């Protein structure tokens, strides 16, 4: 078996950052490749990329880190190869804490003479992953009819983002008039909130 | 340069047959032997199988031997994967890759493909519903964000541009997220407030197994 030392990792930028690979058998080299967002895994392995390792213990070195290294990152075998990867660690950077900026939409008249309705919130750049979010109607709390997809670390912003679309019928729609989004975060202990109240039609 | 294409991907249903096609370029074919790797929703990189300069030696992973027949083509520069009894499993993002570094170190994956979706699933191939999201008001801002939900597909990809790619920083577009076998994705734009709603802006949808080029524009609700 060959494997990493952090599953996951952070560091800010300027700051050293090192990850080891580990095998179980005994090898001249080794490999590391580097995945970014959308993209395909490069070959790697600047000047701020280099390798040290002895005998079976491998190790990759990132010195002055930037926000483009923010990647996943895998290591395979050198001699001995049965071309296997490795684990994998996630590299994450570290940052200032941003406030989300907070977005709410009205389902389209497209959607709506289809039966549907989808009210998507938009919370977009933000520090860290971590967010809360009740979506509200009539100043009620819901917690089922959501689904969420937050991104991972964007590659020059260094920020998460993420899109709650809560899916209800036409029908389900009208008994309740005022829907609203809120959202917790750590950068303010007062949640960031945008709502919209139908009936009050644009 | 040096180019890899993936081909012949898309739907499949467990317990079926798929081939695929990584179309090489820029090298001397036949002096290099290829790899294909698959990657998961999950992310996991998985070797899964190899074959030598020229079809000299092949090896498998453990996922997938018998069922995969690797093979090449060094007169039309052409490598080839079969698959066989499709799983679940098997769903990934397939990639091909040459394996060649020669000197100091050793052989490596050096250049790597665009990668070609390949889905397991006896489910019903749906094509995306392109719903624009403009907001409530037309209030100021520094600047304004807009949206496009790409509602009820399947399978995945989907490939979401703005303005004919023109458009592309202060872009998110998010992953999809999977229930009841239809997936649901939904870009995001921000724009300076100036532009919109005096200029005017477009989300382009593409939804490769439904072969349906959608391009729905976002407009107020007064």
């Known amino acids: 078996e060959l494997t990493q030392s952090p599953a996951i990792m952070s560091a800010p930028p300027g700051e050293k950052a090192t990850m080891t690979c580990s095998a179980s058998?005994?090898?001249?080299?080794m490999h590391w490749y580097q995945q970014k967002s959308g993209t395909s895994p490069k070959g790697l392995i600047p000047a701020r990329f280099s390798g040290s390792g002895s005998g079976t213990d491998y190790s990759l070195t990132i010195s002055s880190v930037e926000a483009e290294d923010a990647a996943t990152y895998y290591c395979?075998?050198?001699?001995?190869?049965?071309?296997?990867f490795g684990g994998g660690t996630k590299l994450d950077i570290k940052r200032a804490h941003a406030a989300p900026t907070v977005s709410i939409f009205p389902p389209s008249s497209e959607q709506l003479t289809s039966g549907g309705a989808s009210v998507v919130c938009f919370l977009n750049n933000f520090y860290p992953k971590d967010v809360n979010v009740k979506w509200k109607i009539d100043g009620s709390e819901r917690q089922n009819g959501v689904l969420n997809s937050w991104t991972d670390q964007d590659s020059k912003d260094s920020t998460y983002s993420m899109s709650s679309t809560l899916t209800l019928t036409k029908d389900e729609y009208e008994r309740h008039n005022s829907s609203t989004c809120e959202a917790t975060h750590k950068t303010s202990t007062s949640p960031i909130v945008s709502s919209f109240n139908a009936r009050e039609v644009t | 340069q040096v180019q890899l294409v993936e081909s012949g991907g898309g739907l499949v249903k467990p317990g079926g047959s798929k081939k695929l096609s990584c179309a090489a370029s820029?090298?001397?074919?036949?002096?290099?032997?290829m790899e294909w790797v698959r990657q998961t929703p999950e992310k996991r990189l998985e070797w899964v199988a190899y074959?030598?300069?020229?079809?000299?030696?092949?090896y498998y992973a453990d996922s997938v031997k018998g069922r995969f027949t690797i093979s090449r083509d060094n007169a039309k520069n052409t490598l080839y994967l079969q698959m066989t009894s499709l799983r679940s499993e098997d769903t990934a993002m397939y990639y091909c890759?040459?394996?060649?570094?020669?000197?100091?170190?050793?052989?490596?994956?050096?250049?790597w493909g665009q990668g070609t979706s390949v889905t397991t699933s006896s489910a019903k191939t749906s094509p995306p519903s392109v719903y624009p999201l403009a907001p409530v008001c037309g209030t100021t801002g520094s600047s304004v964000t807009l949206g496009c939900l790409v509602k009820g597909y399947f399978p995945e990809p989907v490939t979401v541009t703005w303005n004919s790619g023109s458009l592309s920083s202060g872009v998110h577009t998010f992953p999809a997220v999977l229930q009841s076998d239809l997936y649901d994705l939904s870009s995001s734009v921000t724009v300076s407030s100036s532009t919109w709603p005096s200029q005017s802006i477009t989300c382009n949808v593409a939804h490769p197994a439904s072969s349906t080029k959608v391009d729905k524009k976002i407009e107020p609700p007064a």
């Open positions: 890759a040459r394996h060649n570094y020669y000197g100091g170190r050793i052989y490596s994956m050096d250049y």
């Open positions: 395979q075998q050198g001699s001995e190869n049965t071309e296997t």
């Open positions: 058998s005994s090898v001249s080299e």
């Open positions: 820029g090298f001397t074919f036949s002096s290099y032997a």
């Open positions: 074959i030598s300069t020229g079809g000299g030696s092949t």
